Design a protein around this ligand. Structure first.
Ligand code: ZN
Ligand code: ZN
Lengths: 47, 1901
């Protein structure tokens, strides 16, 4: 499920700093609710 | 060698037992048995000896024979894949065979390269011009060079060679060694059962090498085809990366790899469903599948974190930045790694994990789904039965269900039946209901798997410490005596015995239980299986595709959420105590007790087993073993019905607009909402998502209640992600599921009856599926060429029965031109090419031969080194042939080698089987002298005057010998069973050699088609200069079939070819093509993946239209139906002679031996069936899935608005070619937008002209009398006539739940239409609050204003522009007062009808209700009197009651009530209560119509300068008004908007062809209304001996100017009139430039079809510049049929010139008129118009004047046509015309003269009875034409009623005979006894001609 969010975020955003920060937050978080919330937030942040 | 070569593609699994048995029989360096080896060795194998030889070879031949620890010498059978990939035997010197193969194919390609390219380019020009574009070059040579001389092929070649060597070795073994190939870098050992590889060593059994060879050839095919530019580098890179990686991993792990590949299957959908609009579904399935891959990978100890993470990342990497279709293809190829090897233990263990696991069932849930099974069954049976329900349906509480029962309500709402329990209890132990058994002799003639008796192991395998069976159900049943399909069932349902032990593979068991099994399944699927709801699977193909695409569409509008449940384990999960409810219900429903469940019972006291680890085990033993648990695939129909039940229940448990589809176990559901139509897509998808989530949660809960561990592995949900039977559906289109079928591009077909021909066959069909979707067509054509070439090479070198003698192979392998001229001709007409061109754009057939010569002419005239082969085909020696050979198939050219051996093998097998029979009198079903009688009957039917093979085949099919051959043909053809048949050796020795050398003789024949033979002189000219295929086909068929029948030359077939006839032309933006009628539209639409709201149209799905033109003491269907069709065809609907009817009755009397003998002097009901093309056979088997592709035949907008046929019932004589034309247009359009595209391409149309026809061949109809009196021999067990108006209304409004026969009518038609509609709705009233008048009208209109389709058909095909609409608006049935409209009128009529009935309902209970068993008419009367009381009541309530008599009592009481309050005459109150009967609507209607065919006056009851201008605007008239572009043609209503109304032409009264100058005098009148300066008089591109002249006659100018489109070859009439008075005193800029280099008025006129921009702007430019070189006003012909273009055209004109005034005509019939119209720069004004497309108009109200003037003109011209068909004139303007500018006299006895002509023509007819042309059609047509002209000349002698008759007839009903019976005035009678039918016997241009002639005559005198 980790690489799920990783591939999705890579498919969503373009900014380098934002991409790096988001991937950092993904590859270390371990609370499933936070993973769902990452999905929601990042897929919302595409304008 | 002798017969039946082994297979080429496995249909058997690969195990780990047998390969280990081999490799451990000898010493070849865990297992599931460790017992003994020397036992096997001396255990009589000789494979021990052979493998001793193998080990001797290997040990003595390699150096590493005895060393330390094998470290130099390793054998890895653990699925090495990188090793087969590695150079195992890659040493460059190939066997000289394969190099020859390459040389031959490459040379053939280099030869035929240039020709096929020109063929395709000329095919493109012929259709539209330069198709097949990309937004770079292709060629056949490029195909072979990038497909076969590229890498990744040598491996496939190597393994093909290995496969052939092993095949031939196995053959030699069957005939009763090994082959040893010693060589540098490797060693090869091939045994008939095992092969060795080394260079690092491995072994492969027979099936294994087959699997790997297939795998490699398929993989090569896929990557190579992907090298073609079609679906390019993305997929190539991805497939190669994935292949390398997964093969590496398969070596890295072992069998576990397959599991992830399994998961990789479903993985795609996840990657595919990452649809950014709707969330949470991506993170659902993607994450689930990735985690499951992680588990199934780690479970076998690879690595902890780094390797797992990275390998998963890399397995996901090949799916990024793609489009859906590409992903689907990548799936279908992602399955490419060979079917894994099996092991008994694991499969047995899993299916044991499906053994006892818990009796956890929820009684409420199972009871609820039981209730719904009950309601489904009851509703269905009431539906089709159309009477009452079951005999007992109400046992239990609630008088409400009892009400439903006693009242016989056809419906039981799901919402209702949810609120109750035990809705019925059809359970007893007495009798049977609504069915019977003992039918369908098919099933038992089919064999399935069958197991051994109790003592199994010793029969199932060897290695014991004993008896074998090797039986067969088919042999047993065919060799069974006293078999009764019935008594077996009671023997089963009675006392069981311990002789039943089922085995597991598929599944099989003993004979008796399998027999009763198939019997029970037949019963279910035959009677109960029919009752289907919530699923569109009734019809075979059309219904399937249509329903599917409609679901995927109805998801969306200009509410979509699906989910699907898919897996097979679902089936093996049920248990007894959750099936006996339905089992018992159905069992008692069909009578006999405890039947539909017995399987479980047996499985209770029984064990199973899937090779066996022996310690001591021989009987009932507990545990590789199964102990009494479901089943794999038996009885699953009940599973389907129960799944239907549960899906219905879970649906109705919430608000769920549900739609369903299901096959086997895989099912898909759509659910819908009532979303508000303003929220964005996200919100609508969100509501749909909530709804499907509720439905899904409920579904899962209910399944678990019933017990189904339904998980996320099997259920996938989305909004736009349908799936069904491996075919995915995405946003309203089928995905390109091509490449999987691409992987089927094998090298040889199935071995049974293997032969070159059949091989290529599969190729074609395979390529054909490739043609259907995705890849561009031309690539498919080239690919078929390449494949036939390569396969012919592969068969001609190293044949499997290779012979070194002959020279045919020598001459083949010597020259390449020969193989090309064998692979480039239609296989139907000899050769190995199956439908290159025609089938490329259609799945239908027509005639193969005409299509064959179409192919041939295309290729030759394009140039493929072929001209002389045609004459050789002509003078080809005609084959042997026979009456029966011609009989069993028409469309058949007599050639020697056209039946592949597999057919002869099938025949021999079935006949040898039928030789075994100890059954009931079915013995007589086979007799030895059958085929003699067959050929005899073929002769009797075919050795006559005029013979038709189509009717020949139909009759021979339905006759006595027909169904006999059919029975003997419906047997299996499996390799096993045909082998067992051949075990009866005596077929013959001759045919043995024949099949033993087939392909050789075929190639010898076609080689005899060497350089040309001698060309006889007649045919030399007869065929030269390829005029038209059809005549060539006719002559070829004649000359070929000649030697048998000779003189007679059969015809009556051969509809033309689509690509031959149709020419067509495409148009984008501004396009001009061939001067002038179907057309297809395609607006500027963004493809799939954009926005649902931005899709320009409402996406409407069209389908390849396949219609079925289907319109008494016992009536239940039987063979009696067969005799019905027999007589109906055999009588031809015209040939009605005592001989003919006696013969039809006789063939019947021999056919039906079903009841007693049938002696009816005349079978009464047999109706006419040769008047139509209702003659064919099909639709028997289960499924046919591979439908089609649609991704832009979705926004398509067809319309048949131009003339192809008139008011008529052509009934599939033209619909066939019409079907082909529609599908062909669709295919053209798709191919023009095939690859990845956008909306970048702009709005585009396609106009197909049918005018270019080198021969048309008008139809004919005649009779003959056959007589040879031979017969088969068998006796075995098998006043005023408004009744037409009544029946027409009945059928029409019956269809709503085609203007012929509605032509002789009255307003009583719509009267009774309203009557029937009101009757039905009134019964539906149930006394809901509706007061008499206004509310009944309102509710009627509201129930009417819905369900368009049928109303569309009615409107179009009856209310069309001929007199029907004229009569309608004359009787005020409609009302046309912005409405540019045609549809609304329709419904108004019906409403009006109903309203009118109300008025009669005001006073009178008349109109004599009619019906087409007596309870039916009673309840009809009940319905009527209910309507009456509802209208004329309105004083007291009333109650519902019974159907039979209760409402009658209520009516009598209410009448006695209203006795004191009414409107009518009071006594008729009793007469209020004071019913006609028929048989069937269609027969009675058409028979009564054809009974009106007596000269009658039923038509009586049906009984110049007055045009103006619409002066649009003036200078600076800017005031844009609202568009209101509401327009016709919502869906494709039939072809009648402006097609045909020619009777107007009399108002241009001269006898010439131009006749346009009338418009001239009109426009000159309007001109004289206006001042105009000095003249120049330019007439651009028109004036063709026409109008223009009169203009100078009324308006002379100076220096006239003339133009017309230059063609192959000048204004005629202009010179024909004026120059005496004179002398008295397609291109853009070159032509307009010639004009500018060469003031006053100009004249211009053309027309084309829909394109929302102008294309003749150059001519407005012309006017601007010419007046620059003033106020010189234009003349511009145009019309607002597409009013949008008209408004756009006027806005474009509004550029410069102000004061524009258009004037209407007065000569064009009721039709959208052909009205005549009078900034900075041109392109910028054009752009102003373009941006003004949406909202810009200046005609907001002037439409009022236009349309009231149009109705004025319509009335005026109708009156004028009736004036001039009478003696009056329209003068004071015809003289102005004439100034500038058959002759027979009249007598009363012109009718006598017509009698003379009739007698003489009939004498000619009887005389003639006693390249080339026609026989009786020509003379009869000339007779009728002559009679027509004579009548138009003698017009002035007139019984005027007859003149009105013929006036109508010419007005559509063309030429019914006047003097019908007076043809009486003996020999001229008896010589042709059908004089009446003959007397009872239409082309547009001829009609215009006769109207003009009639006008000229009536003006002349
Ligand atoms: Zn045209
Ligand atoms: Zn033609």
């Amino acid at each position: 499920l980790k690489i799920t969010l990783e591939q999705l975020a890579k498919d969503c955003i373009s900014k380098p700093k934002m991409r790096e920060e988001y991937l950092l937050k993904i590859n270390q978080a371990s609370s499933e609710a936070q993973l769902i919330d990452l999905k929601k937030a990042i897929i919302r942040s595409a304008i | 060698r002798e017969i039946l070569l082994p297979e080429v593609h496995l249909n058997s699994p690969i195990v780990k037992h047998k390969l280990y048995y081999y490799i451990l029989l000898g010493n070849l360096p865990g297992p599931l048995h460790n017992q003994n080896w020397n036992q096997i060795a001396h255990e009589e194998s000789n494979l021990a000896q052979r493998l001793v030889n193998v080990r001797n070879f290997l040990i003595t031949h390699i150096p590493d024979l005895r060393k330390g620890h094998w470290q130099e010498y390793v054998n890895v059978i653990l699925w090495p894949r990188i090793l087969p990939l590695i150079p195992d035997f890659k040493i460059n010197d190939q066997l000289p065979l394969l190099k020859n193969w390459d040389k031959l194919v490459k040379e053939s390609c280099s030869v035929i390269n240039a020709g096929t390219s020109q063929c395709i380019q000329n095919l493109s020009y012929g259709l539209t011009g330069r198709g097949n574009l990309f937004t770079r070059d292709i060629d056949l040579k490029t195909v072979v060079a990038a497909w076969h001389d590229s890498d990744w092929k040598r491996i496939s070649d190597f393994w093909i060679m290995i496969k052939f060597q092993m095949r031939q070795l196995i053959v030699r073994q069957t005939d009763h060694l090994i082959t040893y190939i010693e060589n540098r870098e490797g060693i090869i050992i091939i045994t008939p059962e095992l092969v060795a590889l080394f260079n690092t060593l491995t072994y492969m059994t027979f099936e294994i090498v087959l699997m790997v060879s297939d795998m490699y050839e398929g993989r090569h095919n896929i990557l190579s085809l992907c090298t073609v530019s079609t679906y390019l580098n993305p997929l190539k890179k991805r497939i190669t990366y994935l292949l390398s990686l997964v093969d590496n991993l398969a070596f890295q792990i072992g069998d576990a790899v397959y599991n992830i590949i399994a998961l990789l299957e479903s993985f795609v959908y996840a990657q595919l469903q990452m649809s950014d609009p709707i969330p949470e579904l991506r993170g659902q399935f993607h994450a689930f599948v990735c985690s499951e891959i992680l588990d199934a990978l780690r479970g076998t100890n690879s690595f902890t974190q780094d390797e797992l993470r990275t390998v998963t990342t890399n397995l996901i990497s090949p799916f990024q930045d793609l489009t859906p279709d590409l992903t689907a293809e990548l799936l279908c190829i992602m399955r490419l790694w060979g079917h894994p090897m099996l092991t008994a233990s694991q499969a047995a263990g899993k299916v044991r994990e499906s053994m006892c696991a818990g009796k956890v069932l929820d009684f409420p849930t199972i009871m609820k789904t039981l209730a719904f099974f009950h309601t489904i069954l009851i509703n269905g049976y009431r539906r089709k039965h159309h009477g009452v329900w079951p005999p007992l349906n109400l046992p239990g509480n609630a008088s409400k269900g009892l009400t439903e029962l006693m009242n016989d309500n056809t419906e039981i709402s799901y919402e209702f039946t949810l609120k109750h329990w035990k809705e019925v209890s059809l359970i007893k132990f007495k009798k049977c209901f609504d069915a019977d058994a003992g039918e369908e002799l098919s099933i038992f003639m089919k064999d399935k798997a069958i197991s051994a008796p109790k003592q199994d192991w010793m029969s199932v395998f060897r290695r014991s410490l004993p008896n074998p069976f090797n039986r067969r159900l088919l042999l047993n049943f065919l060799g069974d005596d006293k078999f009764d399909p019935n008594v077996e069932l009671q023997y089963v349902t009675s006392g069981h015995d311990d002789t039943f032990c089922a085995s597991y593979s598929f599944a099989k068991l003993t004979k008796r239980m399998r027999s009763c099994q198939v019997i029970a399944e037949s019963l279910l699927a035959n009677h109960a299986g029919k009752l289907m709801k919530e699923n569109g699977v009734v019809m075979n193909q059309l219904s399937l595709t249509k329903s599917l695409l409609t679901m995927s569409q109805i998801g969306i509008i200009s509410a979509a959420s699906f989910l699907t449940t898919d897996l097979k384990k679902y089936c093996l999960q049920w248990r007894y105590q959750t099936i006996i409810p339905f089992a018992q219900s159905l069992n008692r429903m069909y009578g006999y007790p405890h039947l539909f469940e017995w399987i479980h019972l047996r499985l209770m006291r029984s064990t199973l087993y899937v090779f066996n680890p022996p310690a001591d085990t021989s009987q009932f033993d507990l545990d590789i073993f199964i102990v009494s648990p479901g089943i794999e695939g038996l009885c699953q129909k009940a599973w389907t019905m129960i799944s239907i039940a549960v899906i219905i229940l879970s649906a109705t448990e919430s608000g769920t607009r549900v739609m369903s589809m299901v096959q086997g176990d895989n099912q898909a559901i759509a659910v819908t909402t009532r979303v508000p139509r303003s929220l964005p897509t996200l919100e609508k998808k969100t509501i749909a998502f909530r709804s499907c989530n509720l439905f899904f949660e409920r579904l899962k809960c209910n399944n678990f209640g019933l017990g189904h561990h339904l998980k996320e592995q099997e259920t996938i949900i989305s909004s736009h992600f349908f799936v069904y039977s491996k075919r995915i559906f995405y946003q309203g289109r089928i995905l390109t599921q091509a490449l999987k079928n691409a992987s089927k591009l094998c090298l040889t077909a199935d071995v049974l009856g293997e032969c070159t021909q059949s091989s290529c066959s599969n190729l074609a069909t395979t390529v054909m599926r490739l043609t259907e979707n995705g890849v561009e067509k031309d690539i498919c054509f080239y690919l078929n060429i390449y494949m036939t070439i390569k396969q012919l090479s592969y068969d001609i070198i190293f044949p499997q029965v290779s012979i070194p003698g002959d020279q045919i192979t020598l001459e083949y392998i010597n020259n390449p031109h020969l193989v090309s001229r064998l692979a480039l001709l239609p296989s139907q007409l000899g050769g190995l090419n199956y439908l290159s061109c025609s089938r490329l754009f259609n799945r239908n057939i027509g005639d193969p031969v005409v299509s064959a010569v179409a192919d041939l002419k295309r290729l030759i005239k394009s140039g493929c080194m072929d001209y002389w082969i045609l004459y050789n085909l002509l003078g080809r020696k005609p084959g042997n042939g026979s009456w029966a050979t011609l009989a069993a198939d028409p469309y058949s050219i007599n050639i020697e080698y056209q039946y592949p051996p597999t057919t002869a093998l099938k025949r021999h097998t079935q006949q040898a089987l039928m030789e075994l029979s100890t059954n009931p009198m079915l013995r007589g079903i086979f007799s030895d002298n059958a085929q003699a009688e067959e050929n005899n009957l073929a002769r009797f039917l075919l050795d006559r005057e005029v013979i038709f093979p189509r009717v020949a085949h139909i009759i021979i099919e339905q006759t006595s010998v027909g169904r006999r051959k059919q029975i003997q043909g419906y047997l299996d053809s499996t390799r096993s069973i045909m082998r067992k048949s051949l075990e009866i050796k005596p077929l013959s020795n001759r045919k043995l050699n024949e099949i033993l050398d087939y392909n050789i003789n075929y190639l010898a024949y076609n080689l005899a088609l060497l350089k040309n033979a001698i060309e006889p002189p007649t045919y030399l000219k007869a065929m030269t200069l390829e005029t038209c295929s059809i005549d060539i086909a006719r002559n070829l068929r004649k000359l070929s079939w000649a030697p048998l029948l000779g003189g007679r030359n059969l015809e009556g077939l051969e509809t033309p070819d689509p690509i031959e006839i149709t020419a067509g032309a495409l148009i984008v933006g501004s396009g001009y093509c061939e001067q002038c009628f179907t057309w297809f539209f395609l607006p500027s639409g963004i493809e799939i993946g954009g926005d649902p709201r931005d899709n320009p149209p409402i996406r409407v799905p069209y389908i390849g239209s396949r219609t079925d033109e289907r319109r008494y003491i016992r009536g239940a269907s039987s063979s009696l139906k067969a005799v019905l069709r027999l007589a109906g065809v055999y009588i031809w609907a015209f040939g009605d002679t005592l001989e003919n009817w006696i013969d039809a009755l006789d063939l019947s009397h021999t056919r039906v031996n079903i009841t007693l003998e049938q002696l009816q002097s005349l079978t009464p009901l047999p109706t006419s069936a040769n008047l139509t093309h209702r003659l064919d056979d099909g639709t028997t088997t289960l499924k046919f899935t591979p439908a089609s592709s649609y991704t832009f035949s979705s926004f398509t907008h067809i319309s048949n608005d131009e003339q192809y046929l008139t008011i008529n019932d052509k009934t599939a004589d033209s619909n066939i070619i019409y079907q082909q034309l529609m599908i062909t247009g669709l295919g053209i359009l798709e191919t023009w937008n095939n690859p990845p595209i956008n909306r970048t391409f702009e709005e585009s149309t396609l106009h197909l002209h049918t005018g270019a026809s080198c021969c048309v061949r008008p139809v004919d109809s005649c009779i003959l009398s056959e007589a040879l009196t031979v017969k088969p021999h068998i006796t075995v067990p098998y006043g005023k006539l408004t009744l037409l108006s009544q029946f027409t209304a009945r059928q029409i409004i019956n269809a709503i739940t085609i203007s012929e026969c509605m032509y002789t009518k009255l307003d009583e038609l719509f009267m009774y239409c309203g009557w029937e509609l009101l009757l039905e709705l009134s019964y539906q009233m149930y006394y809901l609050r509706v007061v008499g008048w206004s509310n009944i009208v309102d509710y009627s209109y509201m129930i009417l204003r819905r369900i368009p389709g049928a109303a569309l058909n009615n409107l179009a095909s009856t209310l069309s522009h001929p007199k029907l609409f004229r009569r309608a608006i004359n009787l005020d049935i409609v009302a046309p007062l912005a409405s540019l409209d045609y549809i609304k009128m329709s419904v108004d009529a019906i409403l009006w009808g109903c309203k009118r009935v109300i008025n009669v309902l005001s006073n009178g209970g008349d109109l004599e209700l009619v019906v087409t068993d007596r309870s039916m008419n009673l309840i009809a009367r009940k319905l009527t009197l209910l309507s009456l009381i509802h209208h004329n009541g309105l004083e007291l309530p009333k109650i519902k009651g019974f159907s039979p008599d209760e409402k009658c009592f209520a009516l009598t009481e209410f009448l006695r009530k209203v006795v004191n309050s009414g409107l009518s005459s009071i006594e008729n109150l009793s007469n209020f209560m004071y019913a006609a009967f028929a048989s069937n609507n269609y027969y009675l209607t058409r028979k009564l119509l054809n009974s009106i065919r007596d000269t009658e006056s039923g038509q009586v009851a049906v009984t110049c300068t007055n045009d103006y201008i619409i002066w649009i605007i003036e200078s600076n008239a800017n005031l844009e008004k609202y568009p209101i572009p509401n327009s016709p043609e919502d869906d494709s209503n039939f072809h009648n908007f402006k097609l045909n109304a020619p009777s107007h032409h009399t108002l241009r009264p001269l006898g010439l062809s131009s006749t346009a100058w009338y418009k001239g005098i009109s426009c000159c009148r309007y001109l004289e209304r206006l001042k105009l300066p000095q003249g120049d008089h330019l007439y651009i591109a028109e004036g063709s001996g026409a109008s223009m002249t009169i203009i100078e006659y009324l308006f002379p100018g100076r220096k006239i100017y003339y133009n017309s489109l230059f063609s192959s070859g000048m204004p005629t009439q202009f010179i024909e009139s004026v120059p005496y008075k004179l002398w008295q005193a397609i291109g853009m800029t070159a032509c307009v430039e010639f004009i500018i280099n060469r003031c006053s008025l100009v004249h211009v006129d053309l027309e084309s079809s829909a394109s929302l921009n102008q294309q003749c702007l150059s001519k407005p430019i012309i006017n601007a510049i010419i007046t620059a070189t003033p106020h010189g006003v234009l003349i511009l012909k145009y019309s607002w049929l597409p009013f949008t273009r008209f408004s756009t055209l006027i806005t474009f004109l509004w550029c410069y010139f102000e004061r524009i005034t258009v004037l209407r005509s007065t000569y064009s019939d009721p039709a959208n008129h052909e009205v005549y119209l009078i900034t900075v720069s041109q392109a910028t004004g054009m752009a102003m118009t373009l941006t003004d497309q949406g909202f810009t108009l200046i005609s907001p109200e002037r439409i009022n004047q236009y349309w009231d003037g149009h109705l004025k003109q319509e009335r005026i011209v109708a009156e004028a046509i009736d004036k001039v068909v009478l003696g009056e004139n329209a003068l004071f303007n015809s003289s102005d015309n004439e100034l500038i500018l058959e002759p027979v006299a009249t007598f009363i006895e012109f009718e006598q003269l017509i009698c003379t002509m009739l007698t003489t023509h009939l004498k000619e007819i009887i005389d003639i009875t006693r390249g080339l042309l026609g026989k009786i059609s020509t003379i009869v047509r000339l007779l009728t034409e002559r009679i027509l002209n004579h009548t138009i000349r003698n017009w002035l002698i007139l019984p005027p009623s007859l003149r009105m008759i013929v006036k109508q007839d010419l007005e559509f009903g063309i030429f019914r005979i006047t003097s019908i019976l007076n043809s009486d005035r003996l020999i001229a009678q008896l010589t042709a006894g059908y004089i009446r039918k003959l007397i009872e016997g239409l082309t547009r241009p001829i009609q215009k001609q006769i109207w003009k002639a009639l006008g000229c005559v009536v003006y002349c005198h």
